[PDB]
Amino acid sequence: TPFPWNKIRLPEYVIPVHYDLLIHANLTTLTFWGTTKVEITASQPTSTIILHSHHLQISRATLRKRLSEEPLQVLEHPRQEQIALLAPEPLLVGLPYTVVIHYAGNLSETFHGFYKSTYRTKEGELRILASTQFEPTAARMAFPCFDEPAFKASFSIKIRREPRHLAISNMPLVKSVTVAEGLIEDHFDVTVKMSTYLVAFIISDFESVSKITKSGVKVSVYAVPDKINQADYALDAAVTLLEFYEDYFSIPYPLPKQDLAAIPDFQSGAMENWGLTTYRESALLFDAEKSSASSKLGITMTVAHELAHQWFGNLVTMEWWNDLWLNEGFAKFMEFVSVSVTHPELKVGDYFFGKCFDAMEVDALNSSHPVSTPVENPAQIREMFDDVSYDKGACILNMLREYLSADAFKSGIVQYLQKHSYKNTKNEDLWDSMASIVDVKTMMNTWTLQKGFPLITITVRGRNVHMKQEHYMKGDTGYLWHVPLTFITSKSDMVHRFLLKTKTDVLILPEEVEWIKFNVGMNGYYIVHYEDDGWDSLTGLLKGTHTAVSSNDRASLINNAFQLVSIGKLSIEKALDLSLYLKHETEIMPVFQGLNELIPMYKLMEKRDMNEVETQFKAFLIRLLRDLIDKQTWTDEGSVSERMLRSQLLLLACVHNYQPCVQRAEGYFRKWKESNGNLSLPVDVTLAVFAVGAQSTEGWDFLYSKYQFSLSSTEKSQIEFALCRTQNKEKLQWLLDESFKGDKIKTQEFPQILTLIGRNPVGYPLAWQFLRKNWNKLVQKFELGSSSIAHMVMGTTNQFSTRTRLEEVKGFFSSLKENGSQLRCVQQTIETIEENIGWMDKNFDKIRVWLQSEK
């Protein structure tokens, strides 16, 4: 009667070998039935079998061993998400048993488990499909199982369905059998050995398009019938990228087919289920007339990410979620490795360092965590899907690859994948594989087992270049790293290398130089400070001959300058003085970096009684970029980088009431409205045009009236953004209510809408209030620890900068007890607000005076 197992982790001594899964789902009553048969063996004689089960009603369980069979008593521990099957006789070690479980459940109304998705046909008919999302811990909501990623097994899946529905799963359909009136049973081929979280199945009326790889794999894209004509780009990209990975690793994709399914309701961007990868419609479907350049880039990179997982994640899987980065850091990194070859015109390698700066935002906080760090419950496991695992993980891999050389790195990765195929790995296994080709292990332990990153301080005395490292933290630790430093000088644009393994060291230049610049191309996961006249020298370089260093080296100097303000190593005035070089900048990365450093400053001011300085700061920003803004054409011409730069600059200028852009935007919007929304605008100007049009009641209502009928993910995204920019608080309240409800705007959009309104200069109180009042339902929908909940917490609170706002945040989240008070995103936003308070207290008046002098 008392539950015989009191640990969250399963026993290690009962091991599954093979699952037979029968699923019978009813898309009218929104219920399903299942029969799960799992072949198991026991290392220790045990009479209790413990496995995972969550929100399933177990009707019967039996144990099979001359084909004997006997009943098992069923106990449940809902908190541990486990059931116990008690046998009459102890199991015999080494002998194969089969556990048979019959159960029922309800389709989930969330975005995980076996869940309901809906869409409307062009005439307004509601259609229902059922889809799966199991990673990390939701397979147990669809079938009882040993639901930890190291208990790999093969899966034979059978789906019972109505004739009107199509079923697809991980493997090809090998047989369909009519089993009763109006009931067909689909048999799918057995999977290779894999983790439970990769099982997938979808029952829908999707259509598809297909293409065969040179290696014979059938690649298909599935989508709702009204959107299948948008699948062509992703289909071509998936074939090219699958071919790339197969040839790059020389490890073939092992399955006969690869499906890419666009799901109408989906929480993350995509999911790598082996043989059946799934996507938000916005991450897969491309409209040649309406999709933006950034949306095309996003599809390319998301497909690259999911296909990378077929090797990094599916073939080779981390042993436990503490090492999730072995899946996610690699897949994030592989997006850039692959697409830089398959789509050279996208020039994605130029964009990579930006992920590293994103990671450094959270990693500079005490509340960050090491790349590899212990987790136990599902909320903590979901918290591992964060910028540390993804962005820092990819960034330290890039750093290691540059240090070892690409060929040595690749040889280590190939050996790693071959050795651990169909098995599970830990941090140490990766370092051992890399070393089999230098003390990689000691070096990479410093980057994976402690949080944060170092500040490298450079002091030059003639030819003598002194170096110091210290942990960078916004206001003891003693952390030290093995830092692979790089530098160039005024006399040498060769990349020079120095391994700093101690707190201090020195190198001797062959001849004196006029400047030196560390972290070449921003490939290292560290920041740099220059003592003495260093920042003056580099500021003079940027203002005199900025092309003396690369565009990404310029972006790195902009970013680091403002990071040093936060720790008192550089004054805000000197960092702002450096940003003035941007009046002659032309390139997207340093322009975007300037925006990423300066916009957050007025976002803080917007939430304070600071209208005068806020206005003057925004005027400074427009004046700084005015020549570049004025040069933009109102077209879709040019490269992907030119298109994204154009769109962001025109949006920025219009949001800040730069009259030349506002007048042009108003005229386009009036014409678009007069055409009854049938006018083809340049996609690259549509954000600015819609954002301006939405400022009036009539323009907002008209924009919303066209949202219903759009089949374009970009158009829907552009309308959502514009509607969230209104200063009409009643309209902002409506957007929150309706996207929360999910009928007129899908709930998958709510996290973004909440964040957009949290950034609205008049809406931010509404967003914070809405989060507090509707917390419990939002958690039920998206789950504690999810990235969705983290971004809603940060997006409504992390631009506050007063003690009163800080106490609201602390008071609210501490009141949640077990329903959120321990979230890592809460500690992070609290620490961010604390930094914001100190930063504004110190620098606000300095910025005010600097702007007055800037005249």
Ligand SMILES: *[C@@H]1O[C@H](CO)[C@@H](O[C@@H]2O[C@H](CO)[C@@H](O[C@@H]3O[C@H](CO)[C@@H](O)[C@H](O)[C@@H]3O)[C@H](O)[C@H]2NC(C)=O)[C@H](O)[C@H]1NC(C)=O
């Ligand atoms: C999900 O549940 C619904 C509702 O219970 C099932 O719909 C029902 O399906 C049965 C079997 O096809 C229908 O009865 C049959 O009707 C045909 C004539 O259409 C007749 O020839 C048969 O002898 C039998 O009477 C029943 O009308 C239908 N009900 C509704 C409201 O549509 C559905 O089959 C279930 N689907 C799955 C996959 O379990």
Ligand SMILES: C#CC[C@H](CP(=O)(O)[C@@H]([NH3+])CCc1ccccc1)C(=O)N[C@@H](Cc1ccccc1)C([NH3+])=O
């Ligand atoms: C590119 C890409 C695909 C990646 C999801 P994935 O292929 O890594 C899958 N393995 C996550 C499973 C999963 C799903 C839900 C909860 C936990 C885990 C993605 O969507 N990235 C988002 C950020 C993000 C990351 C994780 C979760 C939400 C959002 C982006 N816009 O960058």
Ligand SMILES: *[C@@H]1O[C@H](CO)[C@@H](O[C@@H]2O[C@H](CO)[C@@H](O)[C@H](O)[C@H]2NC(C)=O)[C@H](O)[C@H]1NC(C)=O
């Ligand atoms: C699926 O939902 C149904 C409700 O539609 C649940 O059935 C209820 O179960 C409770 C507890 O035994 C009963 O008191 C109710 O009378 C049941 N309702 C109906 C309409 O029969 C069912 O438990 C849910 N299944 C799971 C696995 O959670």
Ligand SMILES: *[C@@H]1O[C@H](CO)[C@@H](O)[C@H](O)[C@H]1NC(C)=O
């Ligand atoms: C980080 O937080 C822990 C626990 O709250 C505390 O003990 C430690 O001193 C903090 N470190 C810094 C550098 O503030």
Ligand SMILES: *[C@@H]1O[C@H](CO)[C@@H](O)[C@H](O)[C@H]1NC(C)=O
């Ligand atoms: C305008 O309407 C016509 C006719 O319905 C349609 O074919 C065309 O694609 C529409 N164009 C836009 C930009 O909506």
Ligand code: NA
């Ligand atoms: Na998801």
Ligand code: NA
């Ligand atoms: Na999420």
Ligand code: NA
């Ligand atoms: Na969190």
Ligand SMILES: [Zn+2]
């Ligand atoms: Zn991933």
